[model samples]
Target chain A: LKHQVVRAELDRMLDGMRIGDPFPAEREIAEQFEVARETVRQALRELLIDGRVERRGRTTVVARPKIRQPLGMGSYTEAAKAQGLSAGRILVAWSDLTADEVLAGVLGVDVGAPVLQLERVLTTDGVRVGLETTKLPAQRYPGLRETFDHEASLYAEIRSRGIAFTRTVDTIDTALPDAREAALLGADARTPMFLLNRVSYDQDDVAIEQRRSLYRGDRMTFTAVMHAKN
Target chain B: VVRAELDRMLDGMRIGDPFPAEREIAEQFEVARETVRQALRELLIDGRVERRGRTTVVARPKIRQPLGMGSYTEAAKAQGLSAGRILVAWSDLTADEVLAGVLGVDVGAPVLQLERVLTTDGVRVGLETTKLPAQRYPGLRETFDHEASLYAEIRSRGIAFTRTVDTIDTALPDAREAALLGADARTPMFLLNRVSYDQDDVAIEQRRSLYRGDRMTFTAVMHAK
Candidate 1:
């Protein structure tokens, strides 16, 4: 009964803090509740297990909630469009470049072969939400990098140049941003971002560009369609 | 119209590289040069493989995975490939509140959660976690094996790996997860949290999976279907 009383008080304390806001420190919590600091700690640990709170460096904040968006017969452009948002990317840079050993294999180029780099920030609803930096081997497209300007959809540019933008094999992960990247995306220093990385292909299904995208965790969700069982 | 060989050509070709001429491919595959041209046109719509008025190197940039509406295997099969599952670990664990809520069960329920790592060509690509109401699947734990396919097991039990409502997001693994995935913290992973239903639309399973984003992407089809 005493422990229940303590837990109820802890929950009440949490109710006062907003998501992304810090919870009282253990010493502060103990002082306010007239309980031992260890009791306050155990209560906080309970919250963590329940996925309601997260620990930062020295303070604890409410966990950033996740939104699930489905992936059905639509593209990112379409998803952006449907959410009453406009989508676009500023082609930051593009150029014919040298390839490292790993790059060579991805672009299917010979060792020390040439490649192209295309950098851009993908925006949704006029907000910069993701940073996609991509590389394509030159042998795959002789002038692949030449067609891009500072403002064009890489997918569109590839299409206009008579190249078919086919499909990609993707990998996803979550991480905290470094100071510089956080600064670039205007993300909160304490918040973590999602990485939606992929190896893109042309209509021919040739793996052409390998891209890594940094998505704002607070703004995006991923969805998939599953077959129903009988 | 030019046959669609152009796109197929790109799948097998690299940039700045030479490919078989239209006439040669048309002869080799025994399709009409026009049919091959049609396939090439499909590539043009995608814009990875290009033609300088029907002459030049065939190459592409990164391809956007059309995470359209489809099952995992369906998504892969759509790209002219197939997807398969491999069971890794399955166990019967105590059902806590969170998992019980997803499975529409009671508190202090016995829960069966299955863990699996998926692969293509025997290369591990993703990991999955599935939770079920033990009361619903009596021998759930006994039925699953390291080598058997969970999807197949579901069907064999007259229960298909049916419809699911899933939430998707990108995540970076922590040190523990990265070690398990053989990746670094900087590596991105795809997270799929879903609740699957049977023919009656009753929730039967809750799954949380982490996928390798480097080698995979999603495809989805929408309605107003």
Candidate 2:
């Protein structure tokens, strides 16, 4: 009974703080509550397990705004539209180059083959949100890079090139932003980022494009719809 | 003869160590590079090792999280464990948009909201914000004073909770949820959104749960009957 009262009071204290605000230190909480630091520790641990607060190194901060990420394949524009948010893209750059050894292994293609690199940044409402770099094989699609621009959907571009956007295998990793990307994202170097790597294929199971996205962790959450498979 | 030696070569390498060059190892084993590479690929899928860029090395063991059906009580019981809930609040109130959507009732309709945190082995794992249709669970408020099972209370009223729609996702901590769970920001918590339904296929209650991903694992069965 006392625990609930304490927990509710703690919540009331935290709710007064803004997003990205740091949580009170253990010493502060223990002193304010007249309890042992260990007792405050026990109280804080409960909130951590519940995903209400987050620990970033030594300080506790509010969890970032969660962007609902649908696990299955869906267009970012479509997803944003579903949420009634403004979604658009800005073309950063486009180039054609030979695929290197590392990319060759992933795409199961020969090294030194031409690929089209398309880079863009995503925005919702007025705020710039994420950066994406996608590469598609040029040999597989003639003149594919010529017509595509910021206004074009990657899926439509692939289709225009007679390549079908079918499936993708993705992997998630975490990394600190490099100087250039951090500048572009308007984030500091210490910000932990979610690096999403995706290898997409066509109807024939032929590898088509490789996508790398660096998403702001504070502004993202992932949702997956699962079936019973019965 | 060469295949047996190749098996020993791969088996002998320690996890996290760089694998021998495909050609070098293949030549030493008197086998083709492709054959040796095939064995290495199998190791990758077994999560025994990983490949990055052009380098291959043993992989660190990754955690596997289970996502599926079952109530908090049923899930804990399945693990041969007992779970207890501290009903911090259970009040019948006007339904908001979100709660209305969950209960499949009109906005402003009375809804029963229960706030509780579940414990396993007396360790607090997470907190739950549960909301049910007040119309369905009549006298639900009476049991709030006592430590009674909400599920059992509903059942006693002839409302059978037959199905649970679960959405297990990842989220950032909210201030209220964080305080109840006692976690500071930057610690990622798993979000478990559940909608419980009765025999009539009508949604009865919806729960928003935040679980500590690092310490929780839930499993579900896909049975065809």
Candidate 3:
């Protein structure tokens, strides 16, 4: 069938193409392959279903290369800087709250202990990249609200206070963006987003902070390199 | 006013609490039912509320799934839940152009395809589609038991493999996957593409897994060093 031939040629096209390149129009593809428009449509539909091609504005184009997120200890600002992009943050809210049973268990504190709740929106090149909500024991970071400025980097602030993280466990979940998220990120509510929860431990292996972040799924990916432990 | 009041009410409701009925909310806010529907749609899209039966309820938290070389059965056991698998399909096929590149085989080469549904507590949590080069894993089709773990079988055969690279992405489930996983087609799913290498650094297995985003969260330990 012409569908198979068209599909094969489409595969070749993608293999030879780069990310962000514009795909040929259906009529042009039909002419190039000496096939009917319907055949090209059939092949193109399959490619769309497989996520190789996506619509951008009025034309179909190759999907952009996703930002490769390293599963290691690094700040977003540093990562963006390495990629020649500027990063910024907007603090949404910060408060002191009594820890619930779940929070107490996660932070190794007694229930009703005071915890600091901080919320901020991470931006890349002035565009919203993610929203982060963090909770830490209030006693550890005394006078944090007064000493820390909203525009300053949280990681730098934590390090200056003599706290160092030995390791972090990150959990990733995919979900639909909420109304507030869609509005802030300039995306559709139905678009998928990554909900990443991180629990970091100090050198003594004690949990120091629990933070949850929601990232724009289309623009980000997580990669892991593993090795067999001897 | 309607949005603010609804947001306040949602903030007060705990997970698993039945959301206020649309009709009741409409009357309480003195707004049209259509307006209430719009507000509810926004909440639903945000994942703050989930539709259960005829009414909406608070969304449940996702299960924390650890990332490692362990099997699904082992992962669930570590979480204190028994795991089960339902073999949906198995067949032989010739590698097409795409598969040729993915499996590192020439076109028209024989390959074994497997489809399975991963379940916990009778609820489908993931769908797995795997491809194996028929020539490499001889007698795999004949020896595979629907109830046994495929990884264990490979280990028993003395074929040692260590996971080297894992690429994780997100996508909306298709119709077939949605039906098999008992999830709606619109919900986002985690797509994990893994390629494991043997001691000689030969690619041993290439597997693609789709886990329900609503039910699972994959965790990994990142080292600073």
Q: Report the lDDT tens digits of candidate 1 across residue range B1-225.
A: 234445555667666665567788788888887666556554543334567755646643322344322356555555554456766666878766556566777877888778777665445667778887778777767656644555566667777545777777667777866765677886767777778777777777887878766555453323312
RMSD of each: 12.0, 12.4, 11.0
Backbone clashes for every candidate come to 74, 23, 1
Model 3 regions more than 4 Å off: A1-21, A24-64, A77-87, A110-114, A142-153, A177-179, A187-189, B1-64, B91-110, B222-225
Provide the TM-score for each candidate, comma-separated: 0.53, 0.53, 0.69
DockQ of each: 0.19, 0.06, 0.34
lDDT of 3: 0.77
Chain A superposition TM-score per model: 0.60, 0.68, 0.70
Off by over 4 Å in 1: A1-21, A24-53, A57-59, A63-184, A187-215, A223-230, B1-71, B78-82, B145-149, B160-163, B179-182
* Candidate 2 per-residue lDDT over residues B8-99, each given as its tens digit: 65567655788778898788778887677766775564345688778888654222234434356665665445666786676668886556
C-alpha displacement of B54 in model 1, angstroms? Answer: 18
- lDDT values, one for every candidate: 0.64, 0.67, 0.77
Candidate 3 chain B worst ten-residue window by lDDT: B59-68
Error (Å) of candidate 2 at residue A146 is 1.2
Candidate 3 per-residue lDDT, tens place, A1-230, comes to 66677789888887788667777888999998789986777677667645567777766776543455667567777766664556788998997798875667678888889999899888764567788889988878888998998777776787788777778988788877788888877788788899888888877677778998888887666777777662
Q: Write the per-residue lDDT of candidate 3 for residues B97-192, one digit (tens) a residue.
A: 666666678888898888888887667888887787777788887778866687787777776776567778888888888888887878788998
